[PDB]
Enzyme design. Structure first.
Site, mmCIF file in Angstrom:
data_model
loop_
_atom_site.group_PDB
_atom_site.id
_atom_site.type_symbol
_atom_site.label_atom_id
_atom_site.label_comp_id
_atom_site.label_asym_id
_atom_site.label_seq_id
_atom_site.Cartn_x
_atom_site.Cartn_y
_atom_site.Cartn_z
ATOM 1 N N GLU A 35 0.784 -1.227 0.000
ATOM 2 C CA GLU A 35 0.000 0.000 0.000
ATOM 3 C C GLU A 35 0.818 1.280 0.000
ATOM 4 O OE1 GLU A 35 -3.239 0.657 -0.389
ATOM 5 O OE2 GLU A 35 -4.309 -1.189 0.088
ATOM 6 N N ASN A 46 -8.016 8.537 -5.106
ATOM 7 C CA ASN A 46 -8.838 7.374 -5.471
ATOM 8 C C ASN A 46 -9.720 7.829 -6.600
ATOM 9 O OD1 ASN A 46 -9.345 6.795 -1.962
ATOM 10 N ND2 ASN A 46 -7.755 5.945 -3.276
ATOM 11 N N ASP A 49 -13.571 7.159 -6.608
ATOM 12 C CA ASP A 49 -14.221 7.438 -5.355
ATOM 13 C C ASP A 49 -14.246 8.901 -4.978
ATOM 14 O OD1 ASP A 49 -15.565 5.637 -3.508
ATOM 15 O OD2 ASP A 49 -14.102 6.269 -1.972
ATOM 16 N N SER A 51 -12.062 10.800 -3.776
ATOM 17 C CA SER A 51 -11.518 10.875 -2.438
ATOM 18 C C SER A 51 -10.030 10.643 -2.539
ATOM 19 C CB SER A 51 -12.163 9.821 -1.546
ATOM 20 O OG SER A 51 -11.949 8.526 -2.074
ATOM 21 N N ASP A 53 -6.620 8.529 -0.482
ATOM 22 C CA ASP A 53 -6.170 7.534 0.477
ATOM 23 C C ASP A 53 -4.967 8.140 1.183
ATOM 24 O OD1 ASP A 53 -8.028 5.565 0.264
ATOM 25 O OD2 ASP A 53 -6.618 4.019 -0.404
ATOM 26 N N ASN A 60 -9.077 5.565 3.304
ATOM 27 C CA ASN A 60 -9.973 6.382 2.479
ATOM 28 C C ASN A 60 -10.725 7.549 3.168
ATOM 29 O OD1 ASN A 60 -11.870 7.221 0.521
ATOM 30 N ND2 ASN A 60 -12.023 5.161 -0.326
HETATM 31 C C1 LIG Z 1 -7.706 3.006 -0.311
HETATM 32 C C2 LIG Z 1 -8.731 3.228 -1.442
HETATM 33 O O1 LIG Z 1 -8.096 3.129 -2.705
HETATM 34 C C3 LIG Z 1 -9.852 2.202 -1.359
HETATM 35 O O2 LIG Z 1 -10.357 2.193 -0.020
HETATM 36 C C4 LIG Z 1 -11.423 1.363 0.252
HETATM 37 O O3 LIG Z 1 -12.549 1.835 -0.492
HETATM 38 C C5 LIG Z 1 -13.723 1.027 -0.260
HETATM 39 C C6 LIG Z 1 -14.798 1.472 -1.231
HETATM 40 O O4 LIG Z 1 -14.313 1.449 -2.569
HETATM 41 C C7 LIG Z 1 -14.134 1.106 1.204
HETATM 42 O O5 LIG Z 1 -15.266 0.243 1.412
HETATM 43 C C8 LIG Z 1 -16.419 0.805 1.927
HETATM 44 O O6 LIG Z 1 -16.421 0.587 3.343
HETATM 45 C C9 LIG Z 1 -17.585 1.123 3.990
HETATM 46 C C10 LIG Z 1 -17.441 0.813 5.466
HETATM 47 O O7 LIG Z 1 -17.059 -0.536 5.676
HETATM 48 C C11 LIG Z 1 -18.848 0.507 3.405
HETATM 49 O O8 LIG Z 1 -19.990 1.125 3.974
HETATM 50 C C12 LIG Z 1 -18.892 0.672 1.894
HETATM 51 O O9 LIG Z 1 -19.993 -0.055 1.371
HETATM 52 C C13 LIG Z 1 -17.618 0.116 1.290
HETATM 53 O O10 LIG Z 1 -17.556 -1.289 1.529
HETATM 54 C C14 LIG Z 1 -12.978 0.648 2.089
HETATM 55 O O11 LIG Z 1 -13.308 0.848 3.450
HETATM 56 C C15 LIG Z 1 -11.718 1.430 1.747
HETATM 57 N N1 LIG Z 1 -10.581 0.886 2.466
HETATM 58 C C16 LIG Z 1 -9.777 1.692 3.145
HETATM 59 C C17 LIG Z 1 -8.622 1.021 3.848
HETATM 60 O O12 LIG Z 1 -9.973 2.908 3.245
#
Ligand SMILES: *C[C@@H](O)CO[C@@H]1O[C@H](CO)[C@@H](O[C@@H]2O[C@H](CO)[C@@H](O)[C@H](O)[C@@H]2O)[C@H](O)[C@H]1NC(C)=O
Length: 130
Positions: A35, A46, A49, A51, A53, A60
């Protein structure tokens, strides 16, 4: 700062990451290498998204930390994203712990699924004494 490999393993162990929610230290080390390269300053946009990271665990800004410029963010870690850019990783770890407490768990990190899952992860902690 960029952590030496064994320096990070010991720090993460000291902060209670080994076995947290069943996730071993080797797995955490693996996601951290893939990462951010153990770099606390890493920030990546991202693309789908609207957003960003942040930090060592690339958390995120749409769901976990507030960076003040992400549309429709939630901030489940109740942290300002800059707190995840500090040399001291205590806040970043508490937040990563928060992330794995959700249903998807460790699957919230695509890098872990593509590089660590169903892979040897011993190499990340070899020789660290952890
Ligand atoms: C780090 C970035 O490139 C991607 O980060 C991840 O992004 C996903 C969504 O694309 C995040 O998942 C979400 O999580 C929410 C809470 O669990 C949930 O409500 C939503 O439906 C989706 O599953 C994920 O958390 C995120 N990961 C990180 C480490 O930020």
């Amino acid at each position: 700062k960029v952590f030496e490999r064994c320096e990070l393993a010991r720090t993460l162990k000291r902060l209670g990451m080994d076995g947290y929610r069943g996730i071993s230290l080797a797995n955490w080390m693996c996601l951290a290498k893939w990462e951010s390269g153990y770099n606390t300053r890493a920030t990546n946009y991202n693309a789908g998204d609207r957003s960003t990271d942040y930090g060592i665990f690339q958390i995120n800004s749409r769901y976990w930390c507030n960076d003040g410029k992400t549309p429709g963010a939630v901030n489940a870690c109740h942290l300002s994203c800059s707190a995840l850019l500090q040399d001291n990783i205590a806040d970043a770890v508490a937040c990563a712990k928060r992330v794995v407490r959700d249903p998807q768990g460790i699957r919230a990190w695509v890098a872990w699924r593509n590089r660590c899952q169903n892979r040897d992860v011993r190499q990340y902690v070899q020789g660290c004494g952890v």
